[PDB]
Amino acid sequence: GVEIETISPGDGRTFPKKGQTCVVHYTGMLQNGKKFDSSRDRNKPFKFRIGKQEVIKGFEEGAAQMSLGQRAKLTCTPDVAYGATGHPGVIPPNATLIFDVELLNLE
């Protein structure tokens, strides 16, 4: 259950590939519009690698469908999110998440 809505277009030619590192800014908010985390609060990007399950399967699938420079709104249903367990202290159980993510660079 991954839904991608385009906010600002990118170059449309460059895509993340397996084995390399994605550098993104992300803004994670619940389905009700409440924000809980964002890298822009820290003024540094978030680095993760494709294919090594460093992030939840919902976030990884959306990032692979984004182009370099593209910024899009992602929907993370609980099946491709923390699910029934949630995350202690942040995410209520069975919560759907919305991520606003901008791809800056790929290595």
Binding site: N32, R40, D41, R42, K44, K47, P88
Partner: protein, 800 residues
Amino acid sequence: CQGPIEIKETFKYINTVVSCLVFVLGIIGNSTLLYIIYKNKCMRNGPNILIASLALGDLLHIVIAIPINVYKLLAEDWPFGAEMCKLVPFIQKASVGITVLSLCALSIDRYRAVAVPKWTAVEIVLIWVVSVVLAVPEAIGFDIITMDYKGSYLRICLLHPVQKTAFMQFYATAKDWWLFSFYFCLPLAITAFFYTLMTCEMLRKKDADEIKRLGKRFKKLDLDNSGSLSVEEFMSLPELQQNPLVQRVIDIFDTDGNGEVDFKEFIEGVSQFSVKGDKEQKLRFAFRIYDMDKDGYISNGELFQVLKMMVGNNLKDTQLQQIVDKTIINADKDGDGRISFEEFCAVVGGLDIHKKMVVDVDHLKQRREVAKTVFCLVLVFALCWLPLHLARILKLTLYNQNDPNRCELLSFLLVLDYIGINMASLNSCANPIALYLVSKRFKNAFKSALCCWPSHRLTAKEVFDNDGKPRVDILKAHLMKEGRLEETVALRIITEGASILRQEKNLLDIDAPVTVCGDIHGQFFDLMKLFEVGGSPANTRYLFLGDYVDRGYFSIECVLYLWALKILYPKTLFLLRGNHECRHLTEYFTFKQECKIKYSERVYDACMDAFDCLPLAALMNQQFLCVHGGLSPEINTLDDIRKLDRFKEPPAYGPMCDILWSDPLEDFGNEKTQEHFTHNTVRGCSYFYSYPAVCEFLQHNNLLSILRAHEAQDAGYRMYRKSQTTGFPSLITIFSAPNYLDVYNNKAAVLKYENNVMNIRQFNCSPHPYWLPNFMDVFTWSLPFVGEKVTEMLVNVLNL
């Protein structure tokens, strides 16, 4: 004879001194034992609550029986009534009822595992009631009869030589046989029978095939066949070269610190991750991840270095440090600047992380330490009550008065009988002593509780001077450095300030000059940045248009500082109400979660009492109407607001909600229709108010313009269309939150009004400390990642 005369006098002072040593040690040893159980949340357990039942049962015997038992010896008389006489043996024979039965329950409980929970509560109550029912016979028979010594009338408690019923007559004759049977034979048989069966069950299938299974892998992982696993050989698995915690876990496995892991060390570590592993030990492995030097305590610099590995470059060195000091300070219940395992429990007790540290193995082999105490407590009981029962048996079998040298035999017996009583009393003050010396877990807790008996919360004497006026410089500096206040003083600021708000009218009268400020939304470090722009609050009048909380992480500092500033300057600082000062929104947003983490739930309630007293609007120099939101369809004149009842949570509809939620239209000043009010789709309630609505309201009340807030602006202000009647901008929005939500990157503004001159002063964002989402600490933040990583390593090491 002649023997008993000197023996009784010899033990008259010996018995009373021992009872004093029992009293002093018993009252402090047993009470501290209870204080440990409830303070430490890991110590609750199920086998550790029956031990607390032993201490409570013995404490009652110590505080009642022992003192009056001493006064029997010294006075040789009963200065008390008959009711007390039936209370002395009833409790003394009841306390040993709890002691005997608890040791039986403790023995059954430990064999249960090898073969406060809901089923624990029935055990405690059933033990106590059953014990008391069997102490009734003592209470029935004791009374003051049949002594008269040389004309002196003395009161002495004893068992009745003649009983009301024959059942008590049987009890009186075989009293020692009943004491020896139910209180000595019954526990020692049950405790030993289950321990003998426990040893046999543990011995069988202990090694089993599992140790053979892990041995197959251990040789395989040992490439050089040196009999021990090196760090380089652990790096040989491709799946572990990307795990950041492999170097830490190898440190736990390497017990002796020689840098390499042998077979015995390998087997011990895997046992800790079994499906049958208990809660208290899996939390200890997670504890040992952070504890680098294995000194039992997590330090400030060691917690940072561990986190720096897992975080990576996702955070700065300053930001990761800042949350570490806050985590240490909030979790340090001892003020020693470092975290112990008991404090580590209080943070992560309910996180259920232990349910993730699971692999497919068995044979925890940890039943040694916990069961040593149970067998030691039974050991202490057996060696204290053995001499007393042995004296009575000696009387029954070997004593005969017909023997010529009868006096010599009674001489040895009466010396031992007095000793047997003294040792029997020692068991009431011995159980805490044995626990402190046997079990490491109780030993560490006892050391902290007794021997050991910025993070500094400001005290009431410091924030207030002798006149009751808070000192802003002290409060500002402490709050700016992440400091907090005492729980009482936090309530004092909120309550004292709220009273000043309670006396002030719904519609304020504010005279020029004055500074108008918009939303703050918990941006405390942006709030001080506001004050130099507008001027010092002492000599500059400020008007805040609402929104003091939510959307930030320093909401409580904004509340405390403004309410503190309200008390010091009631007539030059004016606070108005925004839509976030209600129970509806703070439940939805983070203000409530902030109050729980930062001060308490009780401070949050105090805020809502003050948030109800906040004024709704102000009249600025008789030309400007100042309000958080905008106009209302149900308000046409200013006196309408004066009639409202503001001391309540705002309703979902009505004039008050329309004041605190209404927004101007997107095409304000260029509306396609002439409708005055339309439904507000953005907010979900209240109304949109258009340009015709504003101009009519201004003219009808002889007003010039309207100052509002509650809408984010890139420049911090927005000058709308100028009114045709006056040539002045009809509506002004002031937004004084720079870099709102840290994602907008906007500017903030404050409005200066003086000499009929309109001035806008802007300022940008300021650096502020970093809080994790929902104000959590790094232990809650990281343990879901620690528990996942160590499980990823262990499954890759074993299962392959």
